[PDB]
């Protein structure tokens, strides 16, 4: 009468065996909708803070992708004004193979290294393509200003 | 029976308005682009053809509470306008007189309840209405 094995299992693990550096906790109404906290990948100009995201399970998934979104303000070539994320495996290279887990990883992954080259980034990444120096100081800068509370 | 978050229903209603619907004479997007919480929206109703509101554009404030969309937006026009159901001196949006936001469903949207507005504009009590000048707006 309830979830798929599927989510079942993969909820379960979530707080049984949580990423390094993520936290992921379910909603206290929606059983598909999770309140996620990843931390500063190290070494980025991110480290020291801590991003809140949402993440909700359609009802097509796993044939759907996750949706996911960042709900910190964050300097990057490849989250948005409104906190969403530009990344394969959200839209184009979702495959039902792929875990919530590795859509986490991969988040964070991008975090430790920006792809200002991507055909969908936003203003930001003219920035970080000719004054990557100065574009990285300001990561740091909002680090700061937004995500150290 | 499926329920997509709040923040995610906002993101299909902001892709659905930068789309847009039919014949484009509803509108609605979001206030503040850099507004994560997606609250605050601006709704744009065109004025009905053979109605007293005709050939004028009509600017809303929508505000979608943390409850959205399980609870109705709330809603008030900038634009000055005479029309029941609508506070006459601050614009505001009295949803016990709109059907749609005083029967309110959860697969409601921005896009409907300013379709029913628009839709209201035309009825009998509202489309002999006098007017006041065009391009008037409320305060605050």
């Known amino acids: ?149 | 029976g499926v329920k997509v978050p709040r923040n995610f229903r906002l993101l299909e209603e902001l892709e659905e308005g930068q789309k847009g619907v039919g014949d484009g004479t509803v509108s609605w997007g979001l206030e503040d682009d850099e507004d994560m919480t997606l609250t605050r929206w601006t709704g744009m109703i065109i004025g009905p053809p053979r109605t007293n509101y005709e050939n004028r554009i009509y600017s809303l404030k929508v505000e979608c509470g943390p409850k959205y969309p399980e609870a109705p937006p709330s809603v008030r026009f900038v634009t000055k306008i005479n029309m029941n159901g609508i506070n006459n001196s601050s614009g505001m949006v009295d949803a016990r007189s709109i059907p749609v936001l005083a029967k309110w469903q959860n697969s409601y949207s921005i896009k409907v309840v300013l379709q029913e507005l628009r839709r209201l504009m035309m009825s009998k009590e509202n489309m002999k209405l006098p007017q006041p000048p065009e391009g008037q707006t409320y305060n605050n």
């Open chain 1, 1 to 149: 009468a309830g979830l798929p094995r599927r989510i079942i299992k993969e909820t379960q693990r979530l707080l049984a065996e949580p990423v390094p550096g993520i936290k992921a906790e379910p909603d206290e109404s929606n059983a598909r909708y999770f309140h996620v906290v990843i931390a500063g990948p190290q070494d980025s100009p991110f480290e020291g803070g801590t991003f809140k995201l949402e993440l909700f399970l359609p009802e097509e998934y796993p044939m759907a992708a996750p949706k996911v979104r960042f709900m910190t303000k964050i300097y990057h070539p490849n989250v948005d004004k409104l906190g969403r994320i530009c990344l394969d495996i959200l839209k184009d290279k979702w495959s039902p193979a792929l875990q919530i887990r590795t859509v986490l990883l991969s988040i964070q992954a991008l975090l430790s290294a920006p792809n200002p080259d991507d055909p969908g980034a936003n203003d930001v990444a003219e920035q970080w393509k000719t004054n990557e120096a100065q574009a990285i100081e300001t990561a740091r800068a909002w680090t700061r200003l937004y995500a150290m509370n």
